Enzyme design. Structure first.
Site, PDB file in Angstrom:
ATOM      1  N   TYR A 112      -1.064  -9.918  -3.997  1.00 48.99           N
ATOM      2  CA  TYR A 112      -1.381  -8.521  -3.700  1.00 48.99           C
ATOM      3  C   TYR A 112      -1.446  -8.251  -2.190  1.00 48.99           C
ATOM      4  O   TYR A 112      -2.081  -9.047  -1.489  1.00 48.99           O
ATOM      5  CB  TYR A 112      -2.764  -8.173  -4.316  1.00 48.99           C
ATOM      6  CG  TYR A 112      -3.040  -6.676  -4.204  1.00 48.99           C
ATOM      7  CD1 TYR A 112      -2.480  -5.774  -5.108  1.00 48.99           C
ATOM      8  CD2 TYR A 112      -3.834  -6.172  -3.195  1.00 48.99           C
ATOM      9  CE1 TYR A 112      -2.709  -4.424  -4.950  1.00 48.99           C
ATOM     10  CE2 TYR A 112      -4.098  -4.819  -3.046  1.00 48.99           C
ATOM     11  CZ  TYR A 112      -3.523  -3.946  -3.944  1.00 48.99           C
ATOM     12  OH  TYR A 112      -3.757  -2.580  -3.881  1.00 48.99           O
ATOM     13  N   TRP A 114      -0.673  -5.204   1.400  1.00 50.93           N
ATOM     14  CA  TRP A 114      -0.027  -4.081   2.047  1.00 50.93           C
ATOM     15  C   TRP A 114       1.183  -4.445   2.865  1.00 50.93           C
ATOM     16  O   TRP A 114       1.963  -3.535   3.185  1.00 50.93           O
ATOM     17  CB  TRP A 114      -1.077  -3.251   2.866  1.00 50.93           C
ATOM     18  CG  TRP A 114      -1.431  -2.055   2.007  1.00 50.93           C
ATOM     19  CD1 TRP A 114      -2.078  -2.110   0.807  1.00 50.93           C
ATOM     20  CD2 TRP A 114      -1.075  -0.690   2.238  1.00 50.93           C
ATOM     21  NE1 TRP A 114      -2.174  -0.835   0.269  1.00 50.93           N
ATOM     22  CE2 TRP A 114      -1.546   0.040   1.126  1.00 50.93           C
ATOM     23  CE3 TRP A 114      -0.334  -0.031   3.207  1.00 50.93           C
ATOM     24  CZ2 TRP A 114      -1.351   1.413   0.995  1.00 50.93           C
ATOM     25  CZ3 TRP A 114      -0.176   1.343   3.112  1.00 50.93           C
ATOM     26  CH2 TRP A 114      -0.690   2.049   2.015  1.00 50.93           C
TER      27      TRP A 114
END
Ligand SMILES: NC1=NC(=O)C2=N[C@H]3C(S)=C(S)[C@@H](COP(=O)(O)OP(=O)(O)OC[C@H]4O[C@@H](n5cnc6c(=O)[nH]c(N)nc65)[C@H](O)[C@@H]4O)O[C@H]3NC2=N1
Ligand SMILES: NC1=NC(=O)C2=N[C@H]3C(S)=C(S)[C@@H](COP(=O)(O)OP(=O)(O)OC[C@H]4O[C@@H](n5cnc6c(=O)[nH]c(N)nc65)[C@H](O)[C@@H]4O)O[C@H]3NC2=N1
Length: 779
Positions: A112, A114
């Site tokens: 996971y 950004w």
């Protein structure tokens, strides 16, 4: 050495870099950006800062003992520098060992994070592309942002809703009379985008202020959104918003003001919710006075707000912090129920919107084509032969530590039961779980279950410090790429041009993975025989062909690259009103729910029989809340998104000087809470509870309501001693204090903002910060 200027982009916007003798020396915002972020100077500094990762490194214990290494010392900085060839051989042998020994269920590839924008250099998709070739992996589902809301919405309004285009900003400026920012700070959170941001919320917000629209903010903190508008500011005790909404709904029923016709023709199940609201079912009428006892908001203010919303065209713009908490599914379900009672859904300027604070939602969409990028290949395969036993191939993202502690155990998710897989290796790129995940002390111990942990990053984050194998990636500024401008607007397509040569021995994630795929015997399958520009040209050419069909003219590839950007025209995008076709004719245009209407009572959820997610919006006590019955700690920590970082990104740069307090992450505290503890502005304090303890530096302000402290998420965890259980964090990672539990059995979302703690002046031995300089062996 190069001298000149180059245009590129990032999560913070489009910019032009000045290059002098081969080094970037300034990033200047794009002239058409209506509201540049002040974080751009930190983006430039992240290329060169002290924590930049120079070389491939292997943890000394892992190098010497492999799977027999002592795993409790991960994070102490005892690394050995190796050559790229050695590192790639080891990563490739470990991926293959784990796939052969344990199967695809042994490798966690959720990773996971950004990362950075870019259709080609998408490190997480590239990771999954390689792992597919290696034999498979366990993936994660959902996200940390709307983990609860994205699962309950499809049962209520039929679609995801949180990541869908909102009624346009210009429609709001001409039609809305009352705008409510509920648990949302759009000024703060609109600085970034998932793809390149166009910062479309800022002109939208300026037009509301120029029109004199009445703005109400419901938030425990006096944010810049409150300040920009001079808004009426309501400050509920955190986690009590559902009780406030119920007291509003109760008032609308008691004074007979609500819209019965909207309820009758567009919703289902209100008759099963009414008895609960009136207290027929539990002997507790959910009045404004009942709501005041839980939330602290005056009963008469609750009533006046309810009447005002009913009589004016009102837009309920809600943010996501209130669903990032225990029983988070109830917050936006109850919000939509309240919106249904007001009867404005589908009218220009009224109803609700869940993405006005994120990535430009509401900025008018263009008629341009969609851009596509590299894929993981799974869509054209025949992946693993999977089956219960070995466990689920996908887990809700925030249950990653539960998975590690309970291999083979069952878990509920949205009406189904699955088993956790038995993972032995994790490969993380573009993400910082040793900052983003909850209950750090629990996670630190659970991570000992992994044999091998591989990380790629370009900064020495706490995650890279904890790896067995660390590989230095490049930034976007050291390579070429292509990306869309505007997650919802689709304003245009940008060429993300290379600015400087790769630093030190850094390599792009694409090159690292191609070299690992090659050692697995699958090199051509990974690369497709294409190089960097060949991939980029094929994405552009595909968009141009789609553009043609639709009547949008786009230049050939090299002409587009010379210009650096293509922009698309807005046709009817400025008139978009969400839910208008449903309001106009609900039989011809029904919602995608079982009844085709807004489900206030859900028979589907009733059948699941979950005690922590009833079949209609319900007030339930959370694990811990400010002034809750028997609560042990006195202050709620607003563990919200940082103003001057993107999560943990940019913490190891020059911008930290502008907000750190004595070197630590800042803690905002109300003057009375400070005075009761003998704390003065600027003191170093120890913030602690039963799960952990951290140091922060206090800034005394009445911007935070009494009983609440603000410590943003994203601080780089800097443990005093990794081998000491519950060690003190010297810098201020707020997730050392949060609990790692699911929102409910329905969504299993994270509860990163359900946090209580105590604060005391720190008087212990002086501490040395070590998180913003590289480990000694990595210099
Ligand atoms: N500058 C910036 N930095 C970032 O890191 C960043 N992250 C991006 C991401 S990934 C996301 S998912 C979005 C998140 O967007 P989201 O709406 O989740 O943002 P938060 O900062 O967690 O919370 C918004 C407001 O909720 C308030 N709040 C907290 N608890 C409560 C409560 O119980 N009740 C009420 N009424 N209000 C409460 C907080 O005080 C805060 O002002 O931001 C995006 N934008 C971002 N911008
Ligand atoms: N308590 C709490 N409250 C919260 O509100 C909260 N917010 C949650 C939310 S909404 C989310 S989205 C998560 C965000 O958590 P997330 O792990 O996404 O946070 P970032 O600090 O953006 O991590 C991105 C990392 O990728 C690296 N990186 C960037 N580009 C590249 C690249 O090209 N290659 C490689 N190899 N690395 C790259 C960056 O350097 C950075 O270290 O935090 C969640 N955590 C939260 N906890």
């Amino acid at each position: 050495l190069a001298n000149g200027t180059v245009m590129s982009g990032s999560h913070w916007g489009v910019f032009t870099a000045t290059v002098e003798n081969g080094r970037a020396t300034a990033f200047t915002p794009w002239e058409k950006d209506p509201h540049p972020s002040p974080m751009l100077a930190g983006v430039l500094d992240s290329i060169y800062s002290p924590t930049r990762i120079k070389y491939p490194m292997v943890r000394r214990e892992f190098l010497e003992k492999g799977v027999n290494a002592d795993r409790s010392t991960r994070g102490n900085g005892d690394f050995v520098r190796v050559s790229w060839d050695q590192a790639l051989d080891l990563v490739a042998a470990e991926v293959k060992r784990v796939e052969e020994t344990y199967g695809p269920q042994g490798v966690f590839g959720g990773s996971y994070g950004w990362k950075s924008p870019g259709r080609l250099h998408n490190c997480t998709t590239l990771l999954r592309r390689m792992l597919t070739l290696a034999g498979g992996y366990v993936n994660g589902a959902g996200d940390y942002s709307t983990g609860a809301a994205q699962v309950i919405m499809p049962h209520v309004v039929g679609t995801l809703e949180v990541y869908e285009q909102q009624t346009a900003w210009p429609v709001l400026a001409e039609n809305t009379e009352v705008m409510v920012f509920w648990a949302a700070d759009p000024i703060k959170t609109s600085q970034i985008g998932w793809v390149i941001p166009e910062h479309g919320a800022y002109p939208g917000l300026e037009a509301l202020k120029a029109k004199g629209t009445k703005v109400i903010v419901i938030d425990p903190v006096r944010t810049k959104t409150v300040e920009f508008f001079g808004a009426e500011h309501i400050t509920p005790k955190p986690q009590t918003d559902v009780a406030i909404m119920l007291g509003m709904a109760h008032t609308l029923v008691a004074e007979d003001l609500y819209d019965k016709d909207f309820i009758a023709n567009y919703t289902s199940g209100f008759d099963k919710f009414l008895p609960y609201l009136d207290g027929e079912t539990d002997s507790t009428p959910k009045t404004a006075e009942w709501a005041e006892g839980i939330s602290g908001v005056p009963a008469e203010t609750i009533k006046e707000l309810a009447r005002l919303f009913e009589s004016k065209r009102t837009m309920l713009a809600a943010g996501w912090s209130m669903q990032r908490m225990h029983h988070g599914e109830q917050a936006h379900w109850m919000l939509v129920t309240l919106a249904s009672m007001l009867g404005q859904i589908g009218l220009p300027g009224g109803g609700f919107g869940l993405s006005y604070h994120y990535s430009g939602g509401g900025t008018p969409s263009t008629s341009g084509p969609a851009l596509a990028g590299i894929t993981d290949g799974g869509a054209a395969t025949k992946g693993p032969e999977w089956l219960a036993a070995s466990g689920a191939s996908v887990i809700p993202v925030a249950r990653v530590v539960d998975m590690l502690e309970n291999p083979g155990a069952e878990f509920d998710f949205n009406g189904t039961r699955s088993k956790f897989p038995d993972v032995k290796m994790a490969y993380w790129v573009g993400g910082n779980p040793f900052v983003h995940h909850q209950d750090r002390n629990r996670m630190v111990k659970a991570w000992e279950k992994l044999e091998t942990f591989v990380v790629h990053d370009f900064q020495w984050t706490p995650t890279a410090r904890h790896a067995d194998i660390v590989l230095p990636a490049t930034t976007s500024y050291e390579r070429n790429d292509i990306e869309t401008i505007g997650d919802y607007s689709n304003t245009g397509i940008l060429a993300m041009k290379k600015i400087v040569e790769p630093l030190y021995e850094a390599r792009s994630d694409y090159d690292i993975f191609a070299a690992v795929a090659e050692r697995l015997g699958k090199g051509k399958e990974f690369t497709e025989g294409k190089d960097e520009m060949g991939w980029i040209k094929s994405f552009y050419d595909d968009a141009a062909k789609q553009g043609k069909a639709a009547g949008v003219e786009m230049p050939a590839f090299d002409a587009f690259w010379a210009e650096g950007i293509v922009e698309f025209p807005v046709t009817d995008g400025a008139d978009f009103v969400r839910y208008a076709s449903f309001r106009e004719d609900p039989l011809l245009n029904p919602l995608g729910t079982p009844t085709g209407l807004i489900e206030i009572y859900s028979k589907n959820i009733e059948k699941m029989g979950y005690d922590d997610c009833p079949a209609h919006p319900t007030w339930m006590e959370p694990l811990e809340r400010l002034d809750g019955p028997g609560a042990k700690y006195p202050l709620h920590i607003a563990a919200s998104h940082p103003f001057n970082r993107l999560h943990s990104q940019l913490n190891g740069t020059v911008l930290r000087e502008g907000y750190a307090v004595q070197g630590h992450e800042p803690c905002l505290m109300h003057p009375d809470d400070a005075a009761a503890r003998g704390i003065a502005d600027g003191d170093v304090v120890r913030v602690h509870n039963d799960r952990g303890q951290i140091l922060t530096g206090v800034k005394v302000t009445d911007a935070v309501m009494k009983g609440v402290i603000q410590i943003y998420e994203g601080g780089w965890y800097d443990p005093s001693d990794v081998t000491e259980p519950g060690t003190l964090d010297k810098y201020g990672d707020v997730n050392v204090l949060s609990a790692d539990i699911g929102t409910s059995k329905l969504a299993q979302g994270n509860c990163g903002q359900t946090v209580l703690a105590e604060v005391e002046k720190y008087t212990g031995p002086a501490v040395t910060l070590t998180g913003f300089v590289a480990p000694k062996a990595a210099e």
